[PDB]
Amino acid sequence: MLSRKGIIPEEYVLTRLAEDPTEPRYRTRERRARFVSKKGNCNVAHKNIREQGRFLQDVFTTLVDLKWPHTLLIFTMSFLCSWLLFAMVWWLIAFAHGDLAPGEGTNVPCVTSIHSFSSAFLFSIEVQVTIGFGGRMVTEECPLAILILIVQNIVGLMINAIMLGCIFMKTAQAHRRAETLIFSKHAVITLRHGRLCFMLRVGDLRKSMIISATIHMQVVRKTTSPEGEVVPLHQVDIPMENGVGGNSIFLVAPLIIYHVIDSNSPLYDLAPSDLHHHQDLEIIVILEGVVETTGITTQARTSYLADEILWGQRFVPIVAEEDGRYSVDYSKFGNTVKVPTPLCTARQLDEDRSLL
Template identity: 50%
Template sequence: KRKIQRYVRKDGKCNVHHGNVRETYRYLTDIFTTLVDLKWRFNLLIFVMVYTVTWLFFGMIWWLIAYVRGDMDHIGDSTWTPCVSNLNGFVSAFLFSIETETTIGYGYRVITDKCPEGIILLLVQSVLGSIVNAFMVGCMFVKISQPKKRAETLVFSTNAVISMRDGKLCLMFRVGDLRNSHIVEASIRAKLIKSKQTKEGEFIPLNQTDINVGYYTGDDRLFLVSPLIISHEINQQSPFWEISKAQLPKEELEIVVILEGMVEATG
């Protein structure tokens, strides 16, 4: 049997590779979507790196403030008021940065009111820390809540069939949901992917044609509680009208079925 490379694989992933992308900066202009689209291992690596870098950055600034003010030269001096009490090196400055940004507040290292630059830095780190938290936690939440795994419990029939139904020749396939939580506002549509040559001689290798599965009658909107048979009538408006039974095995075409809806449990 001749094997044709698929445009969309059985697991729903498009068999398309984007190459020779010159304007890669466009990915950075939409950094949130770029991070969400990354694989989990890169997401977790960036998550750890962002927090570590911010803690190290502000820890360095806290240490520089203490160093410039001369706090390092008066460690243990009860007559000296440091910017941050009990800050005696970069490690303690790094720990204070973590405690400040994560609002842990152990109480051992405390900023004093004799250090205006420290108060300003505290405000800046608190605000920027909240922004980093909102961005990174939001990114992880969207990543976790993506319904990719939900599609694993939506089952399509292995084969589509062409047969008579109510006296009409129809292309039919079945779809079902294995979960008890249903897909809300479910709708289905289908595309025929096939090469085409226009009257002007232009060759379109991946031309997309709509396959009517009940758009005009409302049959494309599904109540997917039990398995349903999706039917497409092969009439004069159908893209299969001019394909005979003998020609069908020789045709290089692909049918892509798209099922859309909202997950009842998560929305």
């Protein structure tokens, strides 16, 4: 009616090719998916999962692990609805017994001094919360009244028990939902003691240190085996080059997670040519451990891409020895500076030792 398409012409057109616009936004998006995010939020599509049945315990568990403002709303609604539901049925019993009827001293009501639904709401509040003023109270010979009083008390006890349990476990567990572990955005490959080393920096933002910190580093690559095996995300564990060869690390001041790339190390063939963004060469560093205060084991994974690895760079020294204590300049924590270093391949570096 009020549209330009009152009659559609549908006439053919002859417009020559003009594809590329001024904006390069059409081809600008070229990001490649990663199975572990920088912030440690791994995201892998678990598509086509067999439908495991759902149980009411999952809903109950979801109540326990809810947030603080949501828990207050759930329990306030639970308390208010419980009082309101029982006030409604209290009103029914009084109505069905003639208590709500106009004044008559002959009969004894099932609940004394119950007149309107407002009194019924107040009576349910007094019974469930156990205030029990006594102006409105239960009487005898009304078996339904005794039965509902038992039901309301039993229901009130179970509701209160759930609230205490939910509150009790909230303070215990929700305190351990904070991740104060920071890695470096970009890792480096430097030349320490003559041997190439892949290094990254990790620090602790909480005064209480992580007890028994274990570090796990894994190279993820679609490594097709020479025999014919093909695996999309094969994980190769990498040693730590620690003082004892173990995975224990002390976290007081941030340190460099340096691993010497040797023949055993899969990074023996690492090159800046294969350092581009579209190369399947990704490092995963995981520092597990238990925080002393609470006792819950904590994990903080991080993923380093080839493009996020800066070849031939050195981490800035951090800890300055002041007169009394040690100064940590966390502003320059993950800042890497260049240094004159060999830029060949660690596999090709074996020739330098052979030549010398």
